Design a protein around this nucleic acid. Structure first.
Lengths: 209, 122, 114, 55, 118, 6
RNA sequence: CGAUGUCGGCUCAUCACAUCCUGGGGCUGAAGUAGGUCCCAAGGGUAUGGCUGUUCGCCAUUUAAAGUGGUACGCGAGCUGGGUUUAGAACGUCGUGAGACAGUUCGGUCCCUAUCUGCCGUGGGCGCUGGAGAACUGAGGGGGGCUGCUCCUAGUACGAGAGGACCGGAGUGGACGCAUCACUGGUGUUCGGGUUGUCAUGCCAAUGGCACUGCCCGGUAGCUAAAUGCGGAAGAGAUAAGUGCUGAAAGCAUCUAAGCACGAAACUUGCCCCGAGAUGAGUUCUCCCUGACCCUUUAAGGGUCCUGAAGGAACGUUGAAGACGACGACGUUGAUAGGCCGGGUGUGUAAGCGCAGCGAUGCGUUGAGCUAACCGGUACUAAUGAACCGUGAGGCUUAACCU
RNA sequence: AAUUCCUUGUCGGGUAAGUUCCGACCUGCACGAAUGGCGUAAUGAUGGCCAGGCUGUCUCCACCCGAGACUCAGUGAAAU
RNA sequence: ACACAGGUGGUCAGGUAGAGAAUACCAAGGCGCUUGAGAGAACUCGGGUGAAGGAACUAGGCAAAAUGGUGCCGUAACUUC
RNA sequence: AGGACCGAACCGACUAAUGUUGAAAAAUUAGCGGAUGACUUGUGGCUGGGGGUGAAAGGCCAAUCAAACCGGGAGAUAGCU
């Protein structure tokens, strides 16, 4: 099937009655209204384009506003697209609610992780630090050697070095969905999903099932 | 979190007062041992009439750890002092006839059920 | 936000007694041994309370037979059943880890009698 | 950590292509005094958004 | 990596930063307008507005608290005798930042900070 | 002088 | 030889296969478990210590296994400097001696701010043929690919008995990696308190400065690991070694010549990420501009006046975004940041006053006072009307339709 | 053995494990008696080894505080 | 060579605590060291703290941590007494 | 009493880190050794180059030492670059 787009609001824990405390992440999966249906005619593939939340009336530009008010929806924050595996139809303008995960058992969550910025190789690539005493000179957390000698004569591409860590799209796979609360539009998953509290999460049914 | 070169107190009465862990058994590159974990020990201090003598190499199981154990609700049980029960090398049964101090409920499996039968608290 | 505090108020128990660091306390917890469930009492001294609402915990230190045992308890978990505050302590700290340092006659504290 | 041979004036100007200063787009005109100033800055005359604040 | 953190370091250690903010708050309370750099003025807002909050409730303990923050009896006198009654209806925002060119000596972004009376 | 190739 | 810094260790690797483990097979002097030997296979993995400067080795204890080699015996403009290889000194030996020793022993300056290539990140310009805002397909590229133990079948098959499975399943670990702070903790020189010496606020009381935050005790938010979730796969296609089916050449036989079916962690996908500068520059949806005239070599021309559109940029308030750029939110038609209010949390019963006592001090007011980054609210302060850039229906040729 | 090549001699102690250390034996390649032999209390920024305490040395790094690195304005080198 | 973190002889020397000319805070007296303003990346420098372990590091406990004052009690082998 | 002990000034220079186109052509920082003596220091003398002086390293003799520095034989000589 398809996924839903929600907002991460914190982590909590559910105390079940037997004793086991399940640490859950709360995803407020709001109503996703379909904006565009891409089909084989115009696009050569089938997919739906959804939106969630609502932007201010004047922050929405004229091309976005015309795209939204072309078919029966009000403007939300950002457009997304799900690839419709062979035999599902979602009419344009349709609000898709959260009971799609009241069906399912496991979930993968896609988000942009928290950005650590320019991180060194010890944080980024788990490099082992050099010996922090015993004579070492200005070389404790430096990367070490980065290539062999005259025969390569060059650093191989894909060398692990210091650089931007975080702030990238990552997907956590096969999380147990603990509770689907339609009355407050809450989806609770077992485990840690990517991103800071407030970033948008794409929630799909688990494909490694 | 018992590693190699950790000095452990001894919970049973095989005779050892204080032993030293020399390898955390089970798996390659393994770092630590918890309460449900077998280690290899060697004996540094013994009692003069006891069964085991100082300088022997045998096996133990940890029963108390200052790092603790984490129960599934999130509660931790942090003992004061690391403690082990000495097992035989190939028999894997305790060499003691009694056990001092309390032990943990997450030790409860068959051979260590024979251990916790002698235990004054679980 | 308003959502997380709402789920915390849904999860929490209405009844939990008022104790402080220093209070000598019995906690009775559930244990399982297969099908058979049992209650087990842990009497010690509350030496740390971590108030967070639902995530509140408290650390009870008990000198067992020869040894020192220490257990934190999730205050709102269903694995606890009762917290009977037996004795009332008169410390003037919030965390009492010097009792983790001290043993014996130096590790005792006077009564509150508020 | 030293050059192997000297870089040309060609490679000098290419590096200094990004060193160019950016001029301000435009200044603002205050409503009362009418003098030019930066955006969100008080005037040299001490006026800011139709209001004299400093003598 | 400074995520969700506050407080500016200002290239001063905590003793120098605290003593400088004590002196700058005394100068702003005494003169009712001072001229400084821009981020110093923003952290000065964050320092000097709780003192005017404290100045509304007149009590001996509040005089001693405001003495512990300012270490000048002239400043607590001007606070509890003028800016207490003057800002008693105002809730928050007793100071105003107005950006005033750049410093001549080093090209530093200057700004005025004043009370909202003038 | 350890850098010399003796 | 107008200098190519060398053994070992550390950090970081990368390739070959002559494979250590895992994977698939043939033969066995292969009953089973376990071996032996040989073929295919490089996807992933491949110890920790004692001794020694050591590599190597011996040993101890593991492991599924502790592979063999190349890379200037990889790696000193990446670190060390134990050995070796300067100058001191000594031993043994050789020499009459100065001195010498692949003979020991003690000690003994390891320089460099990266221009170019390379690599890791990150932008500015222009292009993509009118301009702009988004969402994508996906050429291609990268990441990941390890494995033990226990239980079930089943104590069956086999075997005299000791012992003891193939195939298939279920759980729980080790190492590795990703994510996040809900828990357990670390930190928390921006919060609270104790306390020593001294100086000051006139003094008592109460505070503050300095002494590494003076020394300490707890600790919010962030960040984090030791904490907590997750993941390696199942599946498909074409195969290697091997195994066959029919089957002649060679009336038989024969896996191959015609033909067909099996067959591994290797190969291509399936999983995750980047990705139209993919100049072959793609697709879809939406929005925006519908004016007059001059000149000359009347050309995809140059010029004048008027209008500046969508949108962008600048400016400001700023962000669990960040070296700077960038990215994200907001700019009063407003919760972007500070303040304020309430709560939460942390610390531990503030100051003053009253009482007790000779006083230190205790008790009451009182779980008080003070609370950083948290939470929900609130326009009190600052986010100024604007000005800036971007235009005015967008070439030629051919084809298929419609007036 | 500051001497010993063979060699990590061989035996004992310490260690789970000890080419170094300690005590021995002599097979002294190639000790040896004022270029002194062998012991020696005290001493030593002396060489070697073991134990207790203590620790970020390390497993395995994490956070914080300052000074540079980074951005802005002024000045403004160098080897090559 | 510098308005250079180096060198250079004699005299005076207060308070509080302290054995002290040590050291801490101050007086008289003199200075803030002749580029500043932001930001709060890697990494380097000087530090602070650290769960569990405690030399497993390494050529080597190198470096850090710890010990640290006064009064009394007590104190081994060996010794040139 | 002491070429006695602990430890400032003072004299030295054991270890580590930083510095390595330094703040400095030998230093800084934290620890370190001696600190009533074979001590240390001010001022002035004396010893001079195959010479001095040397608690001896071929050390020091003006940032120079297995024979200083300056000027002269001297445009030494160079089968070598």
């Amino acid at each position: 099937m398809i996924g839903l787009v929600g907002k991460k609001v914190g982590m909590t824990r559910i105390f079940t009655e037997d004793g086991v405390s399940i640490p859950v992440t709360v995803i407020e999966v709001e109503a996703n209204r379909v904006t565009q249906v891409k089909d084989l005619a115009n696009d050569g593939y089938r997919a739906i384009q959804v939106t969630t939340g609502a932007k201010k009336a004047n922050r929405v530009t004229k091309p976005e506003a015309g795209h939204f008010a072309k078919a029966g929806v009000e403007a939300g924050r950002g457009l997304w697209e799900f690839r419709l595996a062979e035999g599902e139809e979602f009419t344009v303008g349709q609000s898709i609610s959260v009971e799609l995960f009241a069906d399912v058992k496991k979930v993968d969550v896609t988000g942009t992780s928290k950005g650590k910025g320019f991180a060194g190789t010890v944080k980024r690539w788990n490099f082992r630090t050099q010996d922090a005493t015993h004579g070492n000179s200005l070389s404790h957390r430096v990367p070490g050697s980065i290539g062999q000698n005259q025969t390569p004569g060059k650093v191989f591409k894909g060398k692990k070095m210091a650089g931007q860590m975080g702030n990238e799209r990552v997907t956590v796979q096969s999380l147990d969905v603990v509770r689907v609360d339609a009355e407050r539009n809450l989806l609770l998953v077992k485990g840690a999903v990517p991103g800071a509290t407030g970033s948008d999460l794409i929630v799909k049914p688990a494909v490694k099932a | 979190m018992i590693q190699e070169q950790t000095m452990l107190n001894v919970a049973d009465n095989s005779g050892a007062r204080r032993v030293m862990c020399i390898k955390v058994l089970g798996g390659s590159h393994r770092r630590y041992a918890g309460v449900g974990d077998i280690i290899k020990i060697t004996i540094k201090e013994a009692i003069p009439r006891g069964k085991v003598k100082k300088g022997d190499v045998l096996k133990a199981v940890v029963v108390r750890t200052k790092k603790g154990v984490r129960r599934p609700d999130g509660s931790v049980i942090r003992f004061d002092g690391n403690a082990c029960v000495l097992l035989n090398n190939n028999s894997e049964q305790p060499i003691g006839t009694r056990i001092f101090g309390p032990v943990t409920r997450e030790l409860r499996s068959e051979k260590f059920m024979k251990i916790i039968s002698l235990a004054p608290e679980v | 936000s308003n959502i997380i505090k709402q789920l915390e108020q849904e999860q929490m128990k209405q009844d939990v007694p008022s104790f402080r660091p220093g209070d000598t306390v019995e906690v009775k917890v559930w244990v399982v041994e297969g099908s058979k469930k049992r209650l087990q009492a842990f009497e010690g001294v509350v030496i740390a309370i971590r108030n967070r609402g639902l995530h509140s915990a408290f650390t009870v230190r008990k000198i067992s037979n020869g040894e020192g045992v220490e257990r934190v308890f999730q205050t709102h978990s269903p694995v606890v059943d009762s917290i009977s505050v037996k004795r009332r302590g008169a410390v003037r700290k919030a965390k009492l880890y010097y009792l983790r340092e001290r043993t014996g006659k130096a590790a005792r504290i006077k009564e509150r009698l508020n | 950590a030293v050059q192997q041979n000297k870089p040309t004036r060609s490679k000098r100007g290419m590096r200094r292509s990004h060193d160019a200063l950016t001029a301000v787009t435009s200044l603002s005109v205050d409503k009362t005094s009418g003098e030019k100033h930066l955006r969100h800055h008080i005037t040299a005359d001490g006026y800011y958004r139709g209001r004299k604040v400093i003598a | 990596m400074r995520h969700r953190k506050s407080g500016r370091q200002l290239n001063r250690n905590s003793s120098h930063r605290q003593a400088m903010f004590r002196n700058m708050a005394g100068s702003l309370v005494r003169h009712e307008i001072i001229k400084t750099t821009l981020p110093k003025a923003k952290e000065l807002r964050r320092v000097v507005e709780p003192l005017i909050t404290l100045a509304k409730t007149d009590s001996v303990a509040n005089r001693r608290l405001a003495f512990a923050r300012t270490r000048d009896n002239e400043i607590v006198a001007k606070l509890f005798n003028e800016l207490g009654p003057r800002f008693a209806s105002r809730a928050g925002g007793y100071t105003r930042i107005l950006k005033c060119g750049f410093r001549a000596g080093d090209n530093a972004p200057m700004a005025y900070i004043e009370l909202v009376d003038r | 002088t350890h850098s010399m190739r003796l």
